[PDB]
Design a protein around this ligand. Structure first.
Ligand SMILES: [Ca+2]
Ligand SMILES: [Ca+2]
Ligand SMILES: [Ca+2]
Ligand SMILES: [Ca+2]
Ligand SMILES: [Ca+2]
Lengths: 219, 219, 219, 219
């Protein structure tokens, strides 16, 4: 019976039947957004949802016999596994992000369809070459996040009052979002020299960021 | 009579006469902006407008005899047909954007002059090699846009209340426009963890965009 | 006497003397900023200024005899002419920008010291290959600017009320500066679909600019 | 005894021991942020802190016998010296940023661990090739900084009232942060033409910046 199902699993029909369901459950997840629609056909789509969820566990079950160990060394398969597992946690208890995390299954459209996998893989592959930079920056953030917390966090606890808070604010300065009128012009009303902290911070972080982009256009 | 007009249409005089009208109507459209001007010479330039619009239909009519099916497979020609047709719809009824969309005819200065044609084409050609990235993103946007609507849309209906609104807000976060003091700091007053949703969103979306820029700087 | 002064002008000492003055008059111009400083040495500097201005007219007079027509075909020299010329208009009558435009003479530090000339020329040389794009864009801005004046200028006359106003607002949207909370969210409170105008605008204009960056990074 | 210690200093165990303390003292500094933690184990940490600071001086002392002059010609060694030196100035007196500047020792993780040194060096090496442009720009900022102080500083002293202030505001316009609604639209309410100063400013500065990015993506 092994080869019987191994022929079902590897079938073009099977994979295309899956891709057909993702597009249906996705279209249907956009509809669950409408408070109007849920009042009409909510029950329609709640069942349809649970239906697809079963089909998806069946597939993942079927897919596992055919591949066994090979399956748990496949990124795309591991994913699919975890994205359905999430979709299995009972519509109750614990946290309700799990209810919301269910929409992550539409990323199976990324998994089930090549070229997407290609493009995704293409992107991801660029990350290891960046890890030296990324490491560098996080040390840098961490160092400044600490200084800022202990330099501005007393008078300005919304923005720098906590280590995590400083992280957030520093990220925001880095994205250059309302950084001057929003954060630093205020700070200087109390700490005239704060510009001495943030302009060097900005150069460095934008510089590094420019290099990183340049590194991705070398490789 | 065919070759007679085929020698009128293909003539340098004809083309340069058309180009002369575009720059003229275009100048006249900048003038129709002034409430002062319209109070003095508005009559002058409405008639001038109808005149050029005739001339352009006459031309487009002529151009079709000389090319027939060759014409409705020309991107640039199809355009002018459409753009002139818009300018034909009666200054009345339906909507008024049809009155406003008339100014689109000044894009004929792009159509009727090479180098422009070249430059535009150079740009457009870059698009197909982006469709794999672009597709990826729209899946991504759609996914998060749904998540956001069900996570933040009840308390924050102006921003995330409806799917389309989440799209709009997510776009804005992506252009990095006032994203922290404008949207996420507010969000955190109610949902402390909202940063867990938007910082990852930012990295991904900005990363992908960096890749796409690098992709265009390879090909 | 021609070769006597052709040996004075072309002298290393002559040039290095000029360069010495630029740095001095520049230093002295940063000091005329202080209302404090002007109250104690204001006169010291006003005369020092008039002095250097003569020395510069003398040089330009000298430089012209040694070069005649060769001079008025030199970008860098023409510059210093027009720049020194500005500084000759009397501290009175007309406009007072002319008084302010005097500090443009510090650009002579660029003109009279090589390597700067290199980099400046390096930069400038890139412009011709952008003229097709720069033209393309200005046509684009112009068409949208007209559309916006007639679509939003009645309710929103500060931002779109005049052809020039629309230009400015459009520029700002393009630099992506406070474009959504600042301009488009307001607009949508009256014109729900305004997003149909501004999102495509952003794509095109940002796209084009990505290409322009890619174009420069090829040539 | 020289070669005895030269074999101590050059030992892998030595370097690794140093790297251990950095990560430990660095972990300790993140905790020194917590107002809670300090009440609990603040003392525990301040002693451990001074301990590490002792150890680090010993190392730097040792490191010098083994390298002498070779050391004070090493960028990375000079740093470690200058950084440990900062941490040596007593917890009292003068400026208390010195207490804060202590956390700069976590940059020793950059110093003691290669790959980091590599990446830093990679970044730093790009700088010399930018000095012509950076010089160009600072002259540019300086000239505009002066014009602005004398053009807008009377009515708008917060933003332009002083040379340094103009510097700050101009930097902010350059980062394109809230530049239009935050600064120039205001300006224009009084000085209608301020746009003639700031749009050209923006073009130039953004142009130059794009060149510098491309310039790096070549070398
Ligand atoms: Ca920005
Ligand atoms: Ca704001
Ligand atoms: Ca901004
Ligand atoms: Ca803003
Ligand atoms: Ca505000």
């Amino acid at each position: 019976m092994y080869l019987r199902i191994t022929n079902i699993v590897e079938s073009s029909f099977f994979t295309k039947f899956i891709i057909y369901l993702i597009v249906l459950n996705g279209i249907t997840m956009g509809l669950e957004t409408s408070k109007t629609f849920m009042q009409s056909f909510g029950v329609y789509t709640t069942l349809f949802n649970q239906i697809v969820i079963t089909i998806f566990t069946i597939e993942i079950i079927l897919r596992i016999y055919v591949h066994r160990i090979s399956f748990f060394k496949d990124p795309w398969s591991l994913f699919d596994f975890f994205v359905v597992a999430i979709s299995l946690v009972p519509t109750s208890s614990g946290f309700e992000i799990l209810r919301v995390l269910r929409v992550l299954r539409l990323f199976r459209l990324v998994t089930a369809v090549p070229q997407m996998r290609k493009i995704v893989s293409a992107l991801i592959s660029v990350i290891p070459g960046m890890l030296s930079v990324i490491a560098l920056m996080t040390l840098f953030f961490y160092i400044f996040a600490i200084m800022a917390t202990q330099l501005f966090g007393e008078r300005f606890p919304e923005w720098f009052g906590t280590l995590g808070e400083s992280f957030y604010t520093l990220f925001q300065v880095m994205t250059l979002d309302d950084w001057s009128n929003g954060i630093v012009r205020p700070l200087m009303e109390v700490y005239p020299y704060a510009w001495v902290f943030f302009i060097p911070f900005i150069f460095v972080v934008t510089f590094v960021m420019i290099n990183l982009v340049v590194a991705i256009c070398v490789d």
